């Protein structure tokens, strides 16, 4: 009847109670917080220990979404996946227009939020 350390998470870290003992009461809960790139998903950002030595939670943090970076005059901003954290958008020009600058951008953590890694390109000539 005993669960060890919490599993560490990709999406959230614990709210600092670092003065922690080797295992945790078979009914204890754990207040968490979203990591950079993620926003709070459910009412409950928490882990919990059940009667039989396991850790259990619902994923309470989801990829934050970027702004759409606006029109690309004479080009095409193409969303591969989506516009949320970790996802790439591609730039490409039309007709005779060549593209100058980055051909990709990725929702990266920026400030306390989430922006595009590379600036928009110019679609010119």
């Amino acid at each position: 009847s005993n669960c060890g350390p919490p599993p560490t998470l990709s999406f959230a870290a614990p709210m600092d109670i670092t003065l922690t003992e080797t295992r945790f009461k078979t009914g204890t809960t754990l207040k968490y917080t979203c990591l950079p790139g993620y926003v709070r998903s459910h009412s409950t950002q928490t882990l919990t220990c059940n009667s039989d030595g396991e850790w259990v939670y619902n994923t309470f943090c989801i990829y934050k979404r970027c702004r759409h970076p606006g029109e690309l005059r004479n080009g095409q901003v193409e969303i591969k996946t989506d516009l949320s954290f970790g996802s790439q958008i591609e730039f490409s020009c039309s007709e005779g227009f060549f593209l100058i600058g980055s051909t990709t951008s990725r929702c990266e953590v920026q400030d306390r939020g989430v922006g595009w890694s590379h600036p928009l390109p110019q679609c010119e000539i």
Binding site: V39, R40, S43, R65, R67, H68, E71, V77, L83
Partner: peptide, 29 residues
């Protein structure tokens, strides 16, 4: 995706504004 971009971004800004406005509340009991 010229005006749909504008629509999305706006929605986002609201949703973002809603997101934590809601949460800052449920946090604040």
């Amino acid at each position: 995706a010229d005006k749909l971009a504008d629509a999305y971004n706006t929605l986002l800004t609201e949703h973002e504004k809603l997101r934590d406005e809601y949460y800052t509340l449920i946090d604040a009991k």
